[PDB]
Amino acid sequence: GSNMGGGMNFGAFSINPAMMAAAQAALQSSWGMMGMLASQQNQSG
Amino acid sequence: GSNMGGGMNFGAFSINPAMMAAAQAALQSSWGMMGMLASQQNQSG
Amino acid sequence: GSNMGGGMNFGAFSINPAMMAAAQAALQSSWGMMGMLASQQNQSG
Amino acid sequence: GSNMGGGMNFGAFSINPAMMAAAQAALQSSWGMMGMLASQQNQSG
Amino acid sequence: GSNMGGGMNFGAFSINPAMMAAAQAALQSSWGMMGMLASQQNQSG
Amino acid sequence: GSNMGGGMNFGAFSINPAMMAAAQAALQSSWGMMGMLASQQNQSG
Amino acid sequence: GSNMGGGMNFGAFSINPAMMAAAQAALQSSWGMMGMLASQQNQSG
Amino acid sequence: GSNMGGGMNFGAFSINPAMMAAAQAALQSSWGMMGMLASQQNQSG
Amino acid sequence: GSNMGGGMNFGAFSINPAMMAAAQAALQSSWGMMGMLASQQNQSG
Amino acid sequence: GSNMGGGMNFGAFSINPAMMAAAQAALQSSWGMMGMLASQQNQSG
Amino acid sequence: GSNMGGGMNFGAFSINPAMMAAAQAALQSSWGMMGMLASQQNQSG
Amino acid sequence: GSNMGGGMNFGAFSINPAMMAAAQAALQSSWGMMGMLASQQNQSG
């Protein structure tokens, strides 16, 4: 069980994420004002 | 079970994400004002 | 079970995501004001 | 089970996503004000 | 089971997505104000 | 069980995260004003 | 010379004005979303 | 010379003005979302 | 010469003005979201 | 020459003005979110 | 020459002005979020 | 020549002004978040 309060952002967020990855499983998620991500990267041997 | 509060953003978000990946499974998700992502990248051997 | 609150964005989001990927499975999703994505990239050996 | 609240965006979103991919399976989805995508890219050996 | 709330966008979204792909299966979907896409790209060996 | 209070940010957050990873499982998530992420990267041998 | 800008009202205005007057000249004008009134009630002795 | 800027009101204005007057000249004007009134009540002795 | 800037009001204004007057000239103007009034009540002796 | 800047009000203004007057000239103006009034009540002896 | 800057009010202003007057000229103006008033009550003997 | 800077008020102003006057000229102006008033009450003998 999880919960988050609500917030207000007046400023302008200039985000410039730059990502690189190399794996058996890879997920790369960039988001702006609000987001939630639940990623289950299952693996065996 | 998950929950998120509601927020208000007056500023203009100029986002410029740049991503590169190399994997057996790859997902790359960029989004603006609001989003949710549940990605199950299942794998065996 | 997941839940998200509602938000209001007055600013104009100029997004310029640029993505590159190389995998057995690849998904690349860019979206503007609101979105949800549930991607199950199943894999065997 | 998933749920999303409703939001209002006054600003004009100029999005310019640019994507490139190379995989056994590839999906590339760009959308504007609202969207949902559930992509199951099944794979065997 | 999935659900989405309703939103209102006053701004004019000038979208210019540009996509390129090379795969055994390829789907590329660009849309404006509202959309949903469920793509099952099945694969064997 | 988790809970978070609500906050207000007047300043404009210019974030420039730059990330690189190399693993059997890799997740890299950059976000702006608000987010939550629960990632279970399961592994066997 | 007079001038007015244009506005947008999403809310539903339930107005219930109740007026009573007793004069040599009487005008009573109730209006909803938009209006202009120029009433010259001239009088002598 | 007069000038007014344009505004947007999301809330629902429930107005209930109640007015009573007794004069040689009487004007009573109730209005909702937008209005202008120029009333010249001229008088002599 | 007069000038006014433009504003946005999210809240719902419940106004309940109640007015009573007794004069040689009387004007009573109640309005909701936006208005301008220029009333010249001229008088002699 | 006069000038006013533009403002944003999130709160809901419940106004309840109550006014009473007795004069040779009387004007009573109640307004909600925005207004301007220029009243010249001219008088002689 | 006059000038005013622009401000933002998050709180809900519950105003309850109550006014009474008795004069040769009387003006009584109550307003909510923003206003300007220039009243010239001219008088002779 | 006059000038004012812009301010932000998070608190909810509950104002309850109560005024009474008796004069040859009377003006009584109550306002909420922002206002300007230039009243010239001219008089002779």
From Swiss-Prot, chains A, B, C, D, E, F, G, H, I, J, K, L:
Free-text note regarding domains: Consists of an N-terminal domain (NTD) and two tandem RNA recognition motifs, RRM1 and RRM2, followed by a C-terminal glycine-rich region.
Pathology linked to this chain's protein: Amyotrophic lateral sclerosis 10: A neurodegenerative disorder affecting upper motor neurons in the brain and lower motor neurons in the brain stem and spinal cord, resulting in fatal paralysis. Sensory abnormalities are absent. The pathologic hallmarks of the disease include pallor of the corticospinal tract due to loss of motor neurons, presence of ubiquitin-positive inclusions within surviving motor neurons, and deposition of pathologic aggregates. The etiology of amyotrophic lateral sclerosis is likely to be multifactorial, involving both genetic and environmental factors.
Native source organism of the sequence: Homo sapiens (Human)
Protein name according to UniProt: TAR DNA-binding protein 43
Subunit structure: Homodimer. Homooligomer (via its N-terminal domain). Interacts with BRDT. Binds specifically to pyrimidine-rich motifs of TAR DNA and to single stranded TG repeated sequences. Binds to RNA, specifically to UG repeated sequences with a minimum of six contiguous repeats. Interacts with ATXN2; the interaction is RNA-dependent. Interacts with MATR3. Interacts with UBQLN2. Interacts with HNRNPA2B1. Interacts with ZNF106. Interacts with CNOT7/CAF1. Interacts with CRY2.
Localization annotation: Nucleus; Cytoplasm; Cytoplasm, Stress granule; Mitochondrion
Portion of the full-length sequence here: 304 to 348 of 414
Top-rank lineage group of the source organism: Eukaryota
Lineage of source species: Eukaryota, Metazoa, Chordata, Craniata, Vertebrata
Its job: RNA-binding protein that is involved in various steps of RNA biogenesis and processing. Preferentially binds, via its two RNA recognition motifs RRM1 and RRM2, to GU-repeats on RNA molecules predominantly localized within long introns and in the 3'UTR of mRNAs. In turn, regulates the splicing of many non-coding and protein-coding RNAs including proteins involved in neuronal survival, as well as mRNAs that encode proteins relevant for neurodegenerative diseases. Plays a role in maintaining mitochondrial homeostasis by regulating the processing of mitochondrial transcripts.
